[PDB]
């Protein structure tokens, strides 16, 4: 009788996954003119 044993290595298996997300943000409004240069009263003529 021997009963003699052996020894191995520590083998482990795992599944890893990292995830993320996305969101789009928008801000708009109906045009009521716009930032202009030389905002002055005018007198058009044809």
């Amino acid at each position: 009788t021997r009963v003699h044993s052996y020894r191995g290595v520590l083998i482990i298996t795992d599944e890893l996954t990292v995830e993320a997300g996305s969101r789009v943000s928008l801000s708009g409004y109906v045009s009521d003119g716009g930032t202009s240069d030389v905002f002055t009263i005018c007198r058009l003529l044809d």
């Binding site: 990292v18 993320a20 997300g21 996305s22 969101r23 789009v24 943000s25 928008l26 801000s27 708009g28 409004y29 109906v30 045009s31 716009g34």
Partner: protein, 108 residues
């Protein structure tokens, strides 16, 4: 969590260039039922995992048209993103819809 450096690098290839407004939600088909014409939108450099519009965008919507949802495009006609504006707007007479800020972000 994901890395901000990774989040910055990943977002550097999106590069949306044109914006198009739709009256209906374009999620099912962002290639259909368009309202306006493609108008150029220029984005900033990726920072803190969030790109933002550089300058304001004015989209000339024709008369008797409604805009409720928006969509972005790239150079090779590939709809990178879709979304919905704040509220529907009906332009009775020919008007302009101005985009104040578009901020595509991935930081959850």
């Amino acid at each position: 969590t994901l890395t901000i450096d990774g989040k910055n690098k990943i977002l550097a290839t999106l590069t949306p260039t044109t914006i198009v407004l739709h009256n209906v939600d374009p999620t099912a088909d962002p290639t259909a039922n368009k309202v306006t014409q493609p108008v150029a939108i220029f984005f900033s450099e990726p920072n803190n995992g969030l790109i933002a519009s550089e300058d304001t965008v004015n989209i000339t919507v024709p008369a008797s048209a409604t805009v409720s949802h928006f969509s972005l495009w790239d150079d090779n006609s590939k709809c990178v993103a879709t979304g919905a504006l704040s509220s529907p707007q009906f332009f009775a007479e020919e008007g302009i819809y101005v985009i104040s800020s578009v901020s595509i972000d991935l930081n959850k």
